[PDB]
């Protein structure tokens, strides 16, 4: 089947500037390509079809272009209401079709903000109950992209943590993120060194906040 | 004016059968040669087409769901319905219905317009309410600016509210979105950044309220010392 | 390249002028 990718994952755009979002298809789809917008909490809304035709009701600052494999949506003079997720969709082999992974347009900060990083051991109460949550906080960072690596006694944890991100702060355009290493109390009390390591543009080298179980 | 309206259950138990209905108004599903489609979107996840149906009963459906999927069409109520059986955790999503264009003369395939959607949560904990435990996220003994918070774990269903110092402290508070654990229970964190200088002077209480279980907690978060 | 196989059946009411569509098409009221 025909695979549509998209680029980039997050596109930071200052209002009034011009957004160029990409969508590339694995084979040729001709002009059979639509664009959708999804503002947070709402359903998708059709923007373009046949790769350049703007749907009735759509502001003319939205314009689509391309043919064959490489396509482009342009938002000329970006408005605030245009901060959303954008999907493309190819439809060459009737009635088959594929959705793109999505590109998010977010607000552009003047300055790069490194995460402020904190690790929280499990509470003593929670420990009494047989569960242990190690929490790692990434406070007020920009841009969105960031990596969290959990490490229990220098062993990379994988598949046992969950992450949550705030929506972009409408004042300072930052994000914040929590990652929770969930871990049984017997597992937890076997190991000593708990760490979370954060990689981000505003950090010159990955930063690791850690604690040793039992000490303060 | 054309409008699409999804109805269905709010919550559903695993292994049970999810039943949804799309109600088309301001128009007739037999007006034109359109197809009508179900599409779902897991939170933080892309768009997943379920199936399309035409007023003739003609239908094509997602391969990876057909063996649990059924899609019907009632032209006398202007409604389209679907059914997923042996529903699983991976079924928790917003379920949309949208008008589809399936034209061959100028090949045309797309979705417009879409309905508001109807969130479907799948939990073993359905039909019951549980209150959260509130554990503290205590400030690192090595605190310039310091961070502390409350872990609001193991409640069902949404929502919880969290404030700090009964609403007096707001500067710097991040109440994260709740995550639906493998247990079927929600969990979230609320954190606040403060200056270390105030850690022994000022005291901090997160105020949790899980109205679906008349659960109210006030947890004082303090340095370990 | 079109995939009429994916339907349970194809209504003639959508075949437009596609000749192949009319071959497997099914007429409806």
Numbering used by the authors:
A (entry chain A): 1 to 216
B (entry chain B): 1 to 143, 147 to 228
C (entry chain D): 162 to 190
Kindly provide excerpts from the paper associated with this entry.
All three mAbs recognize distinct conformational epitopes on the CCD formed by varying conformations of the CCD’s N-terminal region (CCD amino acids 161–171) along with one face of the cysteine loop (CCD amino acids 172–187). The 1G8-CCD complex structure reveals a 1041-Å2interface of which 845-Å2is contributed by the heavy chain and 196-Å2 is contributed by the light chain. The N-terminal tail of the CCD, which includes the known linear epitope amino acids 164–17242, wraps around the heavy and light chain, predominantly interacting with HCDR3, HCDR2, and LCDR3. Five out of six hydrogen bond interactions are found between antibody 1G8 and the CCD backbone.
The attachment glycoprotein (RSV G) binds to the chemokine receptor CX3CR1 to promote viral entry and modulate host immunity. RSV G is a ~ 300 amino acid type II membrane protein. Its extracellular region is composed of two highly-O-glycosylated mucin-like domains flanking a ~ 40 amino acid region known as the central conserved domain (CCD). The CCD interacts with CX3CR1 to promote virus attachment and modulate immune responses.
